[PDB]
Structure 1
């Protein structure tokens, strides 16, 4: 029922979302019931931002699939803000689990170290699954 408005994106979808004064940031579409807030208005979606876990209401027409990765990733913000690197880690970890992807680990690799192969995977088109692997189920 919720979000059945003929527009894009449903509960669980991984997305980039854009707030004024902010880069595109990774998020997951959620039900209004998870937010402790209120039902969304027409054509809007509740999203939860990776990294800080906060909830925002955003137009379905203003979200893009996380799978358009290199297009929306912002290297300048990544190098400038630890909060963006953490967001990218949590977003890509969710993507990895969904795709059944694995990466060679080694304690105690830092944040940047863990991110390196995840970012290469994302920039490379999420092989072998492709973006189909990012879908919820």
Structure 2
């Protein structure tokens, strides 16, 4: 599936915007994951990090998660615990893909864990770069 000529395939980490101004992280999935129907021509099914719901989104409107600082929004991050949770799960998936590790201490909070993950992302996901995030 997803041979319509456009960007993104199954497993790719993406930012999507479906309403208002906010970009949220997601992973492209098979239509089968959704228990809906095959995606319309030009579109991808994505599964949102955090809530795990599904949306059909134009391939031309999605952006790679690797374009990170461009689409991350610190204001929304500080406003919404739902966004903080979304970013954690998204960057955790990224981190495991890249074989990256960060120091941790017993007692660490969601924000404690996110701090080194955000620094890694904003920094261009070194050492792997964006290639580390591929399925």
Alignment TM-score, normalising by the size of structure 2: 0.98
User: Cα deviations across residues 74-111 of structure 1 (Å, max 9, x unaligned)?
Assistant: 01100000000000000000000000000101111000
C-alpha separation in 2, matches of 1:21 and 1:39: 26
Q: Structure 2: which 5+ residue stretches go unaligned?
A: none
Gaps of 5+ in 1: none
Match of 2:89, SS?
helix
SS, match of residue 61 in structure 1: coil
How many residues get paired?
135
* Structure 1 runs, 4 residues or longer, greater than 4 Å off: none
Deviations 1:14-43 (A, max 9, x none): 000011125100000000001111111010
TM-score (norm 1): 0.97
**Partner Cα separation in structure 1 for residue 37 and residue 108 of structure 2:** 40
Counterpart-to-counterpart distance in 2, 1:32 and 1:71 = 28
